[PDB]
Design a protein around this ligand. Structure first.
Ligand code: MG
Ligand code: MG
Ligand code: MG
Ligand code: MG
Ligand code: MG
Ligand code: MG
Ligand code: MG
Ligand code: MG
Ligand code: MG
Ligand code: MG
Ligand code: MG
Ligand code: MG
Lengths: 314, 314, 314, 314, 314, 314
């Protein structure tokens, strides 16, 4: 067992953090650290930085690494996102993760060049995995990449890279089932992570997931934790917990579905604003903004969810 | 605000009326008016005539306008359907609607000629909208037409046509979400209408709809109203109402699904017959009829729904 | 044999005529008759009126019948299009065709109401076929209608309706193959008609077609006739004719492809204008018009085709 | 009525039996008979042998017929599966079924040669049906076969073959709806059978099914029977039964979904093993086996279902 | 090199033989041998027996092996088809092939049970390959099987089975390109075989194929050989040969396309009949027959091809 | 007219240059400039740098700008590619293009963040266009981006950005037709560019293209120029040129098709190597390499094309 005696960095409820943007459009790292600390205190187990929720394409590799360092310095368990323009850059994020003392590695597929090519993905994964060989790793899988990591690739990688311990799935319930049935269900150290906000109950109950990366949990941490706890109890055969998890998931479905689309950072930042956190007002691109109707729509759905939850929870 | 002080013609529960057919296959307008009056008295807010439920392709433009006049004369709030073989005919339905004192306009896409062409749809909508500029209007959207009205078109039309106040969606939950997110959720006079019998809870709860056009509500008015009232309460955050709305919707799903297919008039007329309204026995085409198995199937599903509802409702 | 001793109305090259529109937007029937007479004189065998090329949805049933009468009175062999808003109207076009002395009937599927329902299409076809039992008939088949007439339906109809002698196919080469293999290749009176401008060589050579309805042949009658004659010779095993037919078809492909889309009347009218026939300038809907780029594009493709043909033909 | 006074062989809950495999990889018929007897005693109404659950492709026609005979000799009502490499072999299974005294016939489409050809399927069905004209028959319908039996074929067959009394559907809820609406809902002797483990509630409640063939019911007979009884009560309008049926179906969904895929025999045998029936350890092909992860996954889902059911059921 | 000094059994033009059927519907092996001898004498290099062209599903394993033996005894180089109901039966065809002295092995994917499962296909291929380890082998690839052999599988098999020397592709030009680019183009003993009648020019010219299995070449051996010789010359950069190959392929396309569909044996037998070989009149299933229209269609296309070729060839 | 008196930078044949990689994996700019100079001397009109052919994702923004400067300094007309990780970076490429004296701008859609969102693409295009307002610009359109620039967007941009003069299309013949019909065929300064190696004849002849960006033209400049010259002559109605262009295009089709897939840089570099230019041996990622079979396949297709062309060209 790679992590030995310590509880896995890939278990529990883990927010993918947004990167607060100043008026000058540079990242507010004090605010990032504060939010990170707050979310751990609410019951989250770790954070992910800097992933797509954190606006990685819009920040330099150096900005991201400064962020990671600040979060790690502050005592927050960090899983480092390695999304990058090229392999060399992904690799440098992983080197830095190990150097700085991050607790985990999120290994993202190659983009922009040969993205569909399985042999190129294998070499890219291997480059990243061997760059931080002491840091436990998950592979991120998603239909977005034009490519799917299957059992044969996963285990070929794991044969050479013992730090590969998990699989994070973004795609639908069917893709999750495939991963649970064929990759993550041996009696071993390999675990499945839920990787989209809309697949919580399916992941915990039907797929034996042990952890979940959350976008909406930045905004509704207590409520998302409550869902995961119901799901976990349901996964032990608790009938009442299963029924309650399904209702809470249904109520949370609209707001969670923003995670599935291209505007997830715009939608989740604006919800942070509605919760009163005005550091989430601006975007790194000056012209990126929800429209009037989009705003109206989130406002109504956020109001409806909080009203529902207040009623349902007692 | 276009309608000013009066409650919107596009709110509440609105049946699309069927046109009763005599033995000589001409329309029974006394029966249409009687049914209209009855449905308003059951709690419906307005009616639609003459739409696809009313067999518009099978009736002359003149027959339809006689119908509209009778309904309007009788005190029933009428939303006029403008479905037509060509723009000139659609336009004449709209002129007549304004002349006669109808309360609303359902603006249907061009058919048969250039149906997929967005520029032609724009000109057609504009022709209809400006034909009845004093009558509040909704655009009907449906995958049937080979074409989708998007936010950019809707608002370009609205810039020139202030009577355009609503959007009615027939397509799936995804198409409804798009309309709610991008068209109907500004803090303005623009509202979303549910436009298929199977999308009630999603429309009210998830999409902020304010009204619903109903086919099955001709047959089960009290029960469909009950669903809409549960949904409306659910949309305010009532947990118990949400759970009850989902069960009633599930129970009503088979019968409502007849609205989605090509035989909706055959299925809904025959249900009217089973409820005891024998003016709904015949069709305008002599050869149009449910088959023996189709009849058996509606009979069993109608029996099952009424039995279920009697049990569930107390 | 239904037509007995006379050559089939469904053989040869047959234009679907456009309906010239006056400044007052009413049909110019003198111009329609003149064009009809001209096209027969160029080598066409018959005409179709009033089909989708003739703007049927935009004209009243009465306007169409006046047109048909004028063409028939003038000595032009006419195949009557029965496209209509309903069965009763289709039926009245067929009654009128027989009354007036038209030579053939194009039987169009039911639209707008139950269009996908095979049983309803059967009853509609039967209604039309028995309305003009003395007039030889073809069924029009197209993916547009949401429905396909298959061998079993065709032959069930033919068992009761001996005037059904042909099958006209608009869909792709695959749909044509199905019709040739399973419907039209018995040693009988049943023939296949080419029903889209882009399928000439395939229809004659690969599918044993005996006639072709043409849109672009209104504009380029000599050149389309030349293609059909090459194809006919190719269908007898002439190697040189086959090679020449393929080159002419390739050269004609862009211009012919306008037949496949929603703007065919706009594109073919404008080509008539470019050929110098200014009676084809206007459309029945005032707002229907090719855009500036569309015009530029037809102008360039028309120039290129005529230049090519002048060079290629000697 | 073909079966006259006796209750239909196609009603109730009917397992498709697996064929236990010895160490020498020959079938254990004592074990098959014992399991059959046990399942009837648990409340099952009949069995199916030898279908795809019974590994038909892996056993000789003679092995299958020995099995059928043993089950019939033991007093178990048997529906004989006629899946075969060719029509002649299918026919010999049907001759043998009638000879031996089997109570029903499952008529499987032609495979391997002309599988998509409706005319060939008709002749094949007719061959099988007339081979055992005294034995009540159902046609098996499935997207697997590249082909669908529609109402017109079903009833053309039934006109000549009065022993055809039922329709078994494997495909989705939509395919079941089509069969219920158009084939099985006349007031006649014709019934619908549920033919995939995942469509129980839909089949009984929404489609008027009267019987269900089950794979998972070999393993969880009491629990599957409990679902069918809830569904049957729900189909009479019992609101409480409907709600309970939906929860039990949801809980059973993962395990039932193994029926939908290519590994159903591997998954259901291994569950039999986990229930303690070690005669289900081996497969006819030596190399056919669940992987380590697949095993882990069934183990966890089986544990979770039993835990859930123990809690939910009181 | 596995075949050492001898020319590969997988090069040249190779008919998949049909099995002539007597009046008693048993195979006519004298006629099979005679046809085989004739085709070798016309320039074919080998034959395939018993594949789908030979009606394998309709014949017992023993009938097939008798056929193979007769062909081998007569001096004809035979590639044995291993299509079968199960692995054990496929394996026995391969054992028999080696025993009897067949020159090659066509390795067909598992059907009917686990057909889509790559791991099961691997084990099946391995079973067959090791059953006849002295006989050179190709793997048959086709979209029919619900499964594709990719480079990784091919080469994993080849590492353990040195008799695997070729790849036969039935699917489209794209699937052929994949095989040429990734499997068959190393400077090694591994060759690509064309495996559908419609892909000859693409296979030889664009994909570096070295041999072709032919259905229509049973009927038109000289003409198919002529195409392959043009293609082979084209593949060496001969411009004139390339242009001629494309014309002959186009002329042969309709007749060759019968190979792509479910009726290939019906279509190719009937062509054998039209060529005057009346041993090809009947089918193993009494009810399998081309319809009247299908017959008419082949008759016309066969006439047209022979007429064309007589003209084109001088 | 934006470019005034000078010939458009977007006409003629324009290679997208590859970036030669040293043993230390840094770019060889001397070699890039030399190749650029050579290609202009062979008849190319301009070059594109740094696009996807130039490995843009693998090079820093600074490396790219050094390249652009070197090419511009050397007298080569350069169209600058603006593909980038974010808008700010795209913008800096455009600022630099104008500063340095590049002759044109290739405007690439936003990637990685909001790629499918049309409103975000509009703002991105506007940012780039206004960054280099003096430099003539084309928008690159491709299905890759999850998004299509349509006529309405193009012309809305052009209303504010007079330097937008062209449209470059990568997608299929259908997407090219749409652009020719609706965007580029007004009598204005707006031109269509061919943007994939496989669409040359269609672009020039059928779509009125005036220029072509080429990948394979780096390798076969004379032969690609010869195709474009035939196509240009064909576009003036030259019959002989049209026939010759089609044969040369067919011969070049395999090699050109490498442009359509993910390995285009690997395939085109290796062809440069086969032509004897060994500066194209290595890749920026050490592990990126054609496989043995891929190499074999390009070697055979390159040999076949040169042999064919030597024969065909006299
Ligand atoms: Mg990456
Ligand atoms: Mg595990
Ligand atoms: Mg309309
Ligand atoms: Mg609004
Ligand atoms: Mg019609
Ligand atoms: Mg015929
Ligand atoms: Mg069978
Ligand atoms: Mg029945
Ligand atoms: Mg096999
Ligand atoms: Mg090789
Ligand atoms: Mg970009
Ligand atoms: Mg222009």
């Amino acid at each position: 067992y790679f992590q030995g005696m310590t509880a896995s960095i890939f278990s529990g409820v883990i927010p993918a953090l947004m990167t607060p943007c100043r008026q000058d459009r540079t990242p507010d790292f004090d605010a990032l650290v504060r939010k990170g600390k707050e979310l751990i205190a609410d019951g989250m187990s770790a954070v992910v930085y800097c992933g797509s929720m954190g606006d990685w394409p819009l920040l330099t590799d150096e900005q991201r690494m400064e962020g990671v360092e600040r979060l790690v310095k502050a005592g927050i368990p960090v899983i480092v996102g390695t999304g990058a323009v090229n392999t060399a850059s992904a690799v440098a994020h992983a080197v830095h993760a190990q150097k700085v003392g991050a607790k985990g590695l999120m290994v993202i597929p190659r983009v922009l060049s040969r993205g569909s090519v399985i042999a190129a993905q294998k070499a890219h994964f291997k480059a990243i995995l061997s760059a931080a060989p002491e840091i436990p790793a998950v592979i991120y899988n998603s239909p977005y990449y034009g490519f799917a990591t299957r059992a044969d690739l996963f285990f070929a990688l794991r044969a050479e890279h013992k730090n590969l311990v998990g699989f994070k799935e973004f795609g639908g319930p069917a893709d999750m089932r495939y991963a649970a049935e064929n990759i993550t269900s041996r009696d071993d150290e390999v675990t499945l992570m839920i990787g989209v906000d809309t697949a919580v109950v399916h992941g915990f109950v039907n797929c034996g997931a042990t952890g979940a990366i959350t976008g909406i949990g930045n905004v509704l941490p207590k409520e998302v934790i409550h869902l995961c706890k119901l799901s976990q109890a349901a996964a032990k055969g608790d009938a009442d917990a299963r029924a309650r998890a399904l209702e809470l998931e249904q109520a949370l479905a609209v707001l969670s579905s923003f995670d599935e689309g291209p505007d997830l950072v715009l939608y989740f930042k604006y919800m942070m604003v509605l919760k009163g956190d005005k550091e989430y007002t601006l975007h790194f691109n000056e012209t990126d903004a929800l429209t009037d109707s989009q705003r109206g729509y989130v406002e109504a759905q956020f109001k409806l969810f909080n009203s529902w939850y207040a009623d349902w929870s007692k």
